[PDB]
């Protein structure tokens, strides 16, 4: 209908609970391996925020997987940022992560946090 | 909160 | 770390992309049975927003249940407005089911809710 | 978007 009611911060209290979720391990359902570290997620929030995720998970044969093993060259600490970012809009961009991160945005398929990175590069040089 | 979306 | 960076609308995009990912019933894993109405749903959503959701999905054995059976008291129509507005923060509260919304709210353990229902009918009395 | 929390 048109004459909904909107709750303003109903969005941001969804995404920190799913975040507590995340941390007391509950309901998640796919591993996420990066170079032999390992992630626990919901495959839902992933598929949210990513559109790597989106193609894998809406797969027939790999959305029933309960381990994906992302690429060698994805570095983990730029994939752990990221995931924080998904669970939380909040992203720790610093001088000696920002490489790392933009790359694991470009293979995750985050428009926003490509340009983002992009922006503070290009304000360094 | 509650607004007029 | 204290220097994050925040992206305002991260929420609200990954509240719609869980919404469309319930439209096209993916990765839906619990069926709610309202009354023989059958609403399918992301068990982690409903905990997100329902206080009886998170006790329910919380609970050892009740966790692996793939179908819940709620009071036959709750109204069908006033558990889907309230399933719609905890997928996009918009409650289409209407004279004819604000009764019925309130109700399912107080049961659903949904505080902010009742609070709105309980202000719309005192300023109709 | 983007904005310091
Ligand atoms: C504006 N969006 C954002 O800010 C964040 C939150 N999301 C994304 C950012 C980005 O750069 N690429 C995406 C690609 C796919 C998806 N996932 C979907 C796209 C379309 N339909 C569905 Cl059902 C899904 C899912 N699940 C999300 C993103
Ligand atoms: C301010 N919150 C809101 O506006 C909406 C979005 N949520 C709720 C509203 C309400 O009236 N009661 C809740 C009870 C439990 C939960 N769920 C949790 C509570 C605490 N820790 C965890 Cl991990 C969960 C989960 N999952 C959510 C709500």
């Known amino acids: 209908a048109d004459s909904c009611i909107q709750f303003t911060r109903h969005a941001s209290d969804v995404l920190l609970n799913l975040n507590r979720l995340r941390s007391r391990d509950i309901l998640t359902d796919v591993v996420i391996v990066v170079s032999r570290e390992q992630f626990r997620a919901h495959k839902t929030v992933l598929m949210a925020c990513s559109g790597l995720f989106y193609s894998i998970f809406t797969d027939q044969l790999k959305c029933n997987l309960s381990v994906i093993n992302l690429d060698p060259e994805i570095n983990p600490e730029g994939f752990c940022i990221l995931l924080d970012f998904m669970y939380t809009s909040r992203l720790n961009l610093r001088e000696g992560n920002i490489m790392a991160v933009m790359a694991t945005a470009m293979y995750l398929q985050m428009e926003h946090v490509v340009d983002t990175c992009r922006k503070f590069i290009k304000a360094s040089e | ?5």
């Open chain 2, 1 to 5: 909160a509650w607004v007029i979306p």
